[PDB]
Amino acid sequence: GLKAAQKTLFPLRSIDDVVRLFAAELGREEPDLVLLSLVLGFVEHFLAVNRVGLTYFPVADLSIIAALYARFTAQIRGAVDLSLYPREGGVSSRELVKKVSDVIWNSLSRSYFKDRAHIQSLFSFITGTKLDSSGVAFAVVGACQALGLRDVHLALSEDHAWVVFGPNGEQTAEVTWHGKGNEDRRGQTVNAGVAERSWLYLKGSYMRCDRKMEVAFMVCAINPSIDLHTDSLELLQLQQKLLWLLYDLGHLERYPMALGNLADLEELEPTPGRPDPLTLYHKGIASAKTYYRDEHIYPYIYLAGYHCRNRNVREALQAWADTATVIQDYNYCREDEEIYKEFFEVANDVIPNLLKEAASLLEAGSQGSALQDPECFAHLLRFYDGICKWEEGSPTPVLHVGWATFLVQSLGRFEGQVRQKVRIVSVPGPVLTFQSEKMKGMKELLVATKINSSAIKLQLTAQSQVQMK
């Protein structure tokens, strides 16, 4: 049941009234995830999905929100009989967590597009019987909270979600699917994935949320997109304000991606008196270094994207080199395709486009150009080195000849006299050490006035032979 004190701010008539509700809930012992997600989903539906009749803000009446809450609590209480699953010691059992996951899963529409916008919240679950993959995990945690299961909490990697629970919160369970066409592991631990050093499970350096971080998750999960060309200004403002509320209370400290989201929002529309986007991206990286062993990729990707948008080639290259320095200590495994796609895009599309423009501007007489800076050439080489090291020891390869044409083109954007300045030093001006055997063998080829394209291709793909005839 909603408690009397949870109801006093209704009706919610504005963005600021929604912020007041979040502030009130975050001031409580246990913020009510079900209430909060139903409110966000309600307001997102009427600001992004269907804006017919909108004049300012979709007023959220208690009668409407309370009826949605009742549908959820009735579905969960009726379908999960806690007496079947006695709790030793204030903690939940694997079978109980599996039962709640089954209840959510079985409620979903038989057939729908899982990749759509606006199917993340409990409002989508109730009104449309549709959830995306992490939406199911969040719904399991919200259902568990509604049931009194204080130990069940959301776990997050950079591309997946599951739950932690049990004695000392040390158990893991899969509760949702990952990707498309992968085999389901619902009910199992994540230990095989941690042990194989995949990106998907972050070598165990994943987020273990408390209830406040679960609030931050649902706020990050707001989707302002109305269509491909249009965002809801109202939802952008709501998300931004809610993220600052969380930040001020300390609840983004251990949430690198939320800090990057907040930085991106500040870049779009700065809040007076607040830290610059750059400061916020760096806070996100600092969060990953402090709490997650610097084993997260996306803090650096957020930073590089900012530099790329501002056509700051030097700083973008630096940030992508730093991204690669993280990935080098992973094994590239079968469900890590999203981060492969990110690195492929950066190497084979984004960097080429940046350097093409830089080349034209150099022709027109630019000073201080990245293309005349040997430290920038070094960043490019460190980016490729990290990708090559990533591949070493991995069950599936990364590089192939499709990468080679772009490597040769990108190297060629720097004149030989610039390339010559980098000193490649072994273990045991600009200096660089390579970690990968591929780049060590390429060293020779990196300072010739005209790059030997064929030799580069052979070294990058460890294709051994050239054409017979």
Numbering used by the authors: 2 to 53, 74 to 386, 399 to 461, 548 to 588
Task: Copy the relevant paper text.
We also solved the crystal structures of these menin mutants, showing no structural changes in the MLL1 binding site on menin. We found that point mutations in menin do not change the protein structure and only minimally perturb menin residues surrounding the MBM1 binding site. In contrast to the predictions from computational studies, the crystal structures of the menin mutants revealed that these point mutations have no impact on menin structure or stability. However, activity against menin mutants is significantly reduced, from 5-fold for G331R to over 100-fold for M327I. Biochemical studies have shown that the activity of Revumenib and other advanced menin inhibitors are strongly impaired by these mutations, with over 1 to 2 orders of magnitude loss in potency.
pmcMenin, a 67 kDa protein encoded by the MEN1 (Multiple Endocrine Neoplasia 1) gene, is a chromatin adaptor protein that interacts with MLL1 (Mixed Lineage Leukemia 1, also known as KMT2A) to regulate the expression of multiple genes, including HOXA cluster genes. Menin has been identified as an essential oncogenic co-factor of MLL1 fusion proteins found in acute leukemia patients. Importantly, recent clinical studies found emerging resistance to Revumenib treatment and patient relapse as a result of somatic mutations in MEN1, leading to point mutations of T349M, M327I/V, and G331R/D. Understanding how these mutations affect menin structure as well as the interaction with MLL1 and current menin inhibitors will be crucial in the development of a new generation of inhibitors maintaining their activity against menin mutants.
